[PDB]
Amino acid sequence: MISGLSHITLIVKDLNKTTAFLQNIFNAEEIYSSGDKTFSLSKEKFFLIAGLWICIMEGDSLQERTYNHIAFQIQSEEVDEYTERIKALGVEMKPERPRVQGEGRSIYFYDFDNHLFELHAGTLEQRLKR
Amino acid sequence: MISGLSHITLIVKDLNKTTAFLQNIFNAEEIYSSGDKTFSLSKEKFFLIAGLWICIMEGDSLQERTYNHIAFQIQSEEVDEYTERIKALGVEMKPEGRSIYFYDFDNHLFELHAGTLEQRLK
Numbered sequence A: 001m002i003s004g005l006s007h008i009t010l011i012v013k014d015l016n017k018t019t020a021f022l023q024n025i026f027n028a029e030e031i032y033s034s035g036d037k038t039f040s041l042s043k044e045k046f047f048l049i050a051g052l053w054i055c056i057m058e059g060d061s062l063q064e065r066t067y068n069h070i071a072f073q074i075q076s077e078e079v080d081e082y083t084e085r086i087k088a089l090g091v092e093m094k095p096e097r098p099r100v101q102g103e104g105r106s107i108y109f110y111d112f113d114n115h116l117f118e119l120h121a122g123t124l125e126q127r128l129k130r
Numbered sequence B: 001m002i003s004g005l006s007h008i009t010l011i012v013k014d015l016n017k018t019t020a021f022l023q024n025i026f027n028a029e030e031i032y033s034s035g036d037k038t039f040s041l042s043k044e045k046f047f048l049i050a051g052l053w054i055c056i057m058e059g060d061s062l063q064e065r066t067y068n069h070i071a072f073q074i075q076s077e078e079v080d081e082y083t084e085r086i087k088a089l090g091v092e093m094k095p096e097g098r099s100i101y102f103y104d105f106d107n108h109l110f111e112l113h114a115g116t117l118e119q120r121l122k
């Protein structure tokens, strides 16, 4: 039986450039760098983002943009703020997606490697009470 | 600030196929279903897997296999168990702790990992 989420590993062309993206927007706490030593299979870093263990590895593989996405939890009062923080870094933001009166607000946007991210307000419960 | 993970949404070509997959391996628990083709709305489902909200939507599969992945935690004693359970689904399975990498029918790379972060580092 699965205990829970282990981690999520993303692949990026420019490690350092992606790192700042994570620390600025998600207040990501870097906890490990392959540079923290000599002889590492690959250039990579591990971060803690609200509990979640996120891993970033450098590589040439590029994924085509799709609706597959990871979504983090935020509050409704912080929607504007995050939209300001994202905008202030010039990262691309998708337009408001069609809701269903009872579906909280969301912010969609990419990193530099076609990774669709989302900051979701509103909960799962409010999405089931239907 | 970010309270934590809200959910992960995956796109798949066959909703029913992926479901059986999630149930047979992750013991995924369906908790919601909608999406009416007749009313022009792609189908979707919501499962809970080890407390995590997972949304599956129907659409195109990943055109290419990359190394981006989602990993779930298990005990290192169930490694052999899950290895075989996975071989039983016939899915493409690429041969701190042990892990198991394998794809679904939409080119998503998954992994079951034994051992924790506390370990991995410290």
Ligand SMILES: C[C@H](O)[C@@H](O)P(=O)(O)O
Residues within 6 Å of the ligand: A007, A009, A055, A057, B071, B099, B111, B113
């Ligand atoms: C065994 C682990 O899954 C590693 O390959 P990581 O994805 O943390 O780089």
Ligand SMILES: C[C@H](O)[C@@H](O)P(=O)(O)O
Residues within 6 Å of the ligand: A071, A097, A103, A106, A118, A120, B007, B009, B044, B055, B057
């Ligand atoms: C409001 C949610 O982000 C939905 O649109 P989902 O991505 O779970 O389909």
Ligand SMILES: [Mn+2]
Residues within 6 Å of the ligand: A007, A009, B069, B071, B111
């Ligand atoms: Mn991994």
Ligand SMILES: [Mn+2]
Residues within 6 Å of the ligand: A069, A071, A118, B009
């Ligand atoms: Mn979503």
